[PDB]
Design a binder for this molecule. Structure first.
Ligand SMILES: [Mg+2]
Ligand SMILES: [Mg+2]
Ligand SMILES: [Mg+2]
Ligand SMILES: [Mg+2]
Ligand SMILES: [Mg+2]
Ligand SMILES: [Mg+2]
Ligand SMILES: [Mg+2]
Ligand SMILES: [Mg+2]
Ligand SMILES: [Mg+2]
Ligand SMILES: [Mg+2]
Ligand SMILES: [Mg+2]
Ligand SMILES: [Mg+2]
Ligand SMILES: [Mg+2]
Ligand SMILES: [Mg+2]
Ligand SMILES: [Mg+2]
Ligand SMILES: [Mg+2]
Ligand SMILES: [Mg+2]
Ligand SMILES: [Mg+2]
Ligand SMILES: [Mg+2]
Ligand SMILES: [Mg+2]
Ligand SMILES: [Mg+2]
Ligand SMILES: [Mg+2]
Ligand SMILES: [Mg+2]
Ligand SMILES: [Mg+2]
Ligand SMILES: [Mg+2]
Ligand SMILES: [Mg+2]
Ligand SMILES: [Mg+2]
Ligand SMILES: [Mg+2]
Ligand SMILES: [Mg+2]
Ligand SMILES: [Mg+2]
Ligand SMILES: [Mg+2]
Ligand SMILES: [Mg+2]
Lengths: 171, 98, 142, 206, 58
RNA sequence: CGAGAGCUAACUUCCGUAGCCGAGAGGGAAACAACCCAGACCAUCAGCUAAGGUCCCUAAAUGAUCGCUCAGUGGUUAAGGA
RNA sequence: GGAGGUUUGGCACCUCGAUGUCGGCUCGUCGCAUCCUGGGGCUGAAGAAGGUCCCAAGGGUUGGGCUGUUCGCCCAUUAAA
RNA sequence: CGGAACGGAUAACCGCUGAAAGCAUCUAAGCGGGAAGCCAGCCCCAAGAUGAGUUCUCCCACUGAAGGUAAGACUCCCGGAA
């Protein structure tokens, strides 16, 4: 189980039938939640209490609590994922807001951000993604990573910036 | 409006001339005073053991044999066909009770 | 001996469908069409009310049914097999779904065809039949 | 989308550069804009236009009045082109430019009641090795008792002819502007002098 | 007969099973269903029997 | 139900035994000699029930109370796995 | 331990007042336990060519010599026979 | 000349956020990606879609179910890559 919280100073939390609204430095980060749970807060700090200890009842508590944790902490401080391309060539660049990968294929491979997500290419072989909705930053980083998921032999491709990987042997 | 309940006689708030099953009182003599379980006299409905309070007379009008019917029966591939005559006796009566 | 009447009545009613399960609403409409609500004065004649469903596209299927429910219908042709439209993509033309229920329970005879006439589905919140002045009737039964 | 009517005239030889090619000459003469159908007044968007004038003596009164709404001479054929919204009258030049692909739709040549060897490319059966279905005959026609059926759809002797046929990606070879002629690469269906219609490619492939 | 009786039964907010159980629960109602039908064709008396029956399952 | 023969196959074949069918109508089992109910003297626009049922087709509680399964399981098996 | 009913059967239920039988030819249509093609997982998968399993029935699946043959063998090709 | 592209929802599969177990997990709520296959897209039929659809236009309101008639079909003649 998990329950303790930390709402900071520059944010505000509404409440309505379980489904709250939130604003702050970047507002309109609403999330769905179930009515069967108790959407609540004291004031200086929040909580989600579980009315009943049932199994399916218990799962929703931890789901909803991490979801409020990410959704509020993202408007309070934000999320930023970093990655590196590896392999011969494998360029990346920024055209306006779009990210031009130039990575091991006959064509350039472009990605156009969904709204709220900001690409950044601090180094020619360094991708970075910035945003609030952690779910969407994760799907965006995944959409870039899938373009060349690492091979089992030499590790060409997208990698999380600190990432290690196994290498099969071969000839 | 109301009708005999076939099982023997016995009925509700009528005024007419109806057939029914045979009465074992012959002639127009019977003057049968039957019990009735319901009545809408005065549009005032009355039923139940209230209707064991009220009773209606009705003269016997005529003994009679109804329209003929055959009783035919069949079964396949067994030869067996059956045929018989039948007419149901009755005693028509006209109503004039309370 | 038994009273029978003339078909003199012609009655119009607006069933709602929004939030209602399908089937639950469908049997209510099938009962109103087939005439059980009034003293079902004859088998012989169709004395049921005319039934004008609205907001049918807000119909509810209470299970997983919105997927995985199937709608087989044979075009005579081989390979015209189970031409399965099944789901909520049949809510591309929502009204027939509801029809298909009540006609699943309306009689299959000459008369049973002919009563389907009086079923007037309307997936939107609006219907033309203001000239009939249909009467409201609640989706809860008791 | 854009289209016009005309009449197949005949076929010929042609030389674009040095490559000899078979063209077909349609005459796509001017078409009046009779009726401007809009969805706000007709439920769907389209335009109906005419071809080959009819002597006014031959018109019904209702058709003289149909045209008479539009200030247009009676024309023996009217047709509707979906999504098409021109202005004035539909001359063929303006609609087409040389080399563009255009679908060509006309009515196939009625060959009447045709056997199966002719209609569906049936095989035939030996013409000497025993028979008395020497040619022509469809042979067997089903399974046996299970499905007693013969399939709905089954191919059989019949009216091979007269179908509407569309033919895709024909190439405008040339455009004679002041004659209202239009060359098209290769063949179009019909007897000569039948109506046909030329249109933009139904699938604009890359 | 039965099919016509439960129609008025439900018309009043009872039903055939409960309504004949209430017309039986008072001993004095012994009329045939056909006569309950004819009463279903006379609404006032039918409602009188409905209130009679319903005052017997209480 | 109890055996043999068979492969502890068969709407298989051969015996014992009970019941039905043959010779059996009527309600149930969608349909259906064998199963479950129940043995048709005749007539009725009368009543209680059997089996079986009570959402609509389709007669009759969208009955009541504590649960169980979210699989359409219900509405086609097992060794084995979770 | 199951599955399917395509084999050789068993059984003897409708058909001996007739249910034409093997092979070919002609038309076909269906299953999928998938020969090709499409999407995958693992691979003792470097690449290429593969193996094997999963999802997939839209379409497609060659012509000849031998024999009545089905089949099988062979010629010569195939995305595949 | 054609099979096709673009689209949508999908199978195996691949993932995002993520609990029930303060880890981890593509799923238990939720979301995204993925086939010659499913729906749409191409060509043809089709309102006997008795649920009979729309639009444009024409003849009008005659005399005693009938009858002369309008608008307008047909019969027949001559022919037709029908
Ligand atoms: Mg016998
Ligand atoms: Mg030949
Ligand atoms: Mg034959
Ligand atoms: Mg069969
Ligand atoms: Mg058949
Ligand atoms: Mg043995
Ligand atoms: Mg035997
Ligand atoms: Mg025997
Ligand atoms: Mg015998
Ligand atoms: Mg016996
Ligand atoms: Mg029996
Ligand atoms: Mg059965
Ligand atoms: Mg039966
Ligand atoms: Mg028999
Ligand atoms: Mg018998
Ligand atoms: Mg039997
Ligand atoms: Mg029993
Ligand atoms: Mg009873
Ligand atoms: Mg019982
Ligand atoms: Mg009922
Ligand atoms: Mg087990
Ligand atoms: Mg014979
Ligand atoms: Mg014969
Ligand atoms: Mg498969
Ligand atoms: Mg492959
Ligand atoms: Mg390789
Ligand atoms: Mg095949
Ligand atoms: Mg595509
Ligand atoms: Mg999934
Ligand atoms: Mg998608
Ligand atoms: Mg293709
Ligand atoms: Mg007339």
């Amino acid at each position: 189980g998990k329950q303790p919280i930390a709402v900071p100073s520059g944010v505000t939390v509404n409440a309505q039938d379980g489904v709250f609204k939130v604003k702050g430095p970047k507002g309109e980060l609403t999330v769905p939640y179930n009515t069967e749970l108790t959407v609540r807060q004291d004031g200086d700090q929040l909580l989600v209490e579980r009315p009943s200890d049932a199994q399916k009842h218990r799962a929703l508590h931890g789901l909803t609590r991490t979801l409020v944790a990410n959704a509020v902490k993202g408007v309070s401080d934000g999320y930023t994922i970093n990655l590196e391309l590896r392999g011969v060539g494998f360029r990346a660049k920024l055209t306006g807001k779009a990210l031009e990968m130039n990575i091991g294929y006959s064509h350039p491979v472009i990605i156009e951000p969904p709204a709220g997500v900001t690409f950044a290419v601090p180094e020619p072989t360094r991708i970075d993604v910035s945003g609030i909705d952690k779910q969407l930053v994760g799907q965006v980083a995944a959409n870039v990573r899938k373009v060349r998921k690492p091979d089992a032999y030499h590790g060409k491709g997208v990698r999380f910036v600190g990432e290690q990987i196994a290498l099969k042997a071969g000839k | 409006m109301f009708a005999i309940i076939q099982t023997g006689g016995k009925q509700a708030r009528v005024s007419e001339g109806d057939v029914i099953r045979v009465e074992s009182l012959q002639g127009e003599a019977g003057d049968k005073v039957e019990l009735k379980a319901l009545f809408v006299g005065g549009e005032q409905t009355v039923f139940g053991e209230d209707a064991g309070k009220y009773t209606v007379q009705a003269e016997v009008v005529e003994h009679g044999r109804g329209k003929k019917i055959y009783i035919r029966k069949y079964k396949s591939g067994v030869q067996y066909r059956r045929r018989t005559g039948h007419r149901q006796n009755f005693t028509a009566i006209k109503i004039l009770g309370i | 001996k038994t009273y029978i009447p003339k078909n003199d009545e012609q009655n119009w009613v607006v069933v709602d469908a929004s939030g209602v399960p399908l089937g639950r609403l469908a049997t209510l409409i099938a009962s109103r069409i087939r005439g059980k609500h009034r003293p079902d004065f004859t088998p012989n004649m169709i004395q049921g009310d005319f039934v004008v469903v609205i907001n049918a596209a807000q119909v509810a299927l209470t299970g997983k049914k919105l997927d995985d429910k199937v709608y087989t219908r044979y075009t005579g042709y081989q390979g015209g097999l189970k031409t399965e439209t099944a789901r909520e993509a049949l809510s591309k033309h929502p009204e027939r779904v509801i029809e298909h229920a009540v006609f699943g329970m309306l009689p299959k005879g000459r008369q049973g065809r002919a009563m389907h006439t009086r079923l007037k589905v309307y997936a939107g919140e609006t219907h033309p039949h203001s000239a009939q002045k249909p009467q409201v009737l609640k989706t809860q039964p008791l | 989308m854009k289209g016009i009517l005309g009449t197949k005239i005949g076929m010929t030889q042609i030389w674009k550069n040095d490559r000899a090619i078979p063209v077909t000459v349609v005459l796509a003469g001017p078409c009046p804009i009779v009726q401007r159908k809009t969805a706000q007044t007709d439920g769907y968007e389209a335009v109906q236009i005419g071809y080959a004038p009819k002597a006014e003596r031959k018109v019904n009164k209702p058709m003289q009045g149909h045209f008479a709404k539009a200030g247009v001479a009676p024309t023996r054929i009217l047709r509707e082109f979906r999504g098409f919204a021109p202005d004035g009258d539909s001359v063929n030049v303006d609609i087409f430019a040389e080399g563009e692909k255009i679908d060509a739709t006309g009515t196939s040549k009625g060959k009447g009641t045709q056997g199966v060897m002719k209609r569906w490319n049936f095989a035939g059966g030996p013409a000497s090795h025993g028979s008395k279905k020497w040619h022509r005959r469809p042979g067997s026609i089903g399974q046996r008792k299970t499905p007693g059926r013969v399939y709905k759809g089954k191919r059989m002797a019949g009216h091979m002819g007269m179908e509407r046929v569309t033919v895709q990606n024909l190439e405008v070879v040339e455009i004679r502007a002041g004659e209202n002629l239009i060359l098209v690469k290769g063949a179009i269906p019909g007897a000569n002098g039948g109506l046909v219609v030329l249109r933009s490619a139904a699938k604009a492939s890359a | 007969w039965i099919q016509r009786i439960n129609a008025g039964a439900r018309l009043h907010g009872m039903n055939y099973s409960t309504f004949i159980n209430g017309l039986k629960r008072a001993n004095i109602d012994l009329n045939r269903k056909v006569l309950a039908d004819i009463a279903a064709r006379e609404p006032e008396a039918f409602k009188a029997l409905v209130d009679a029956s319903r005052n017997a399952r209480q």
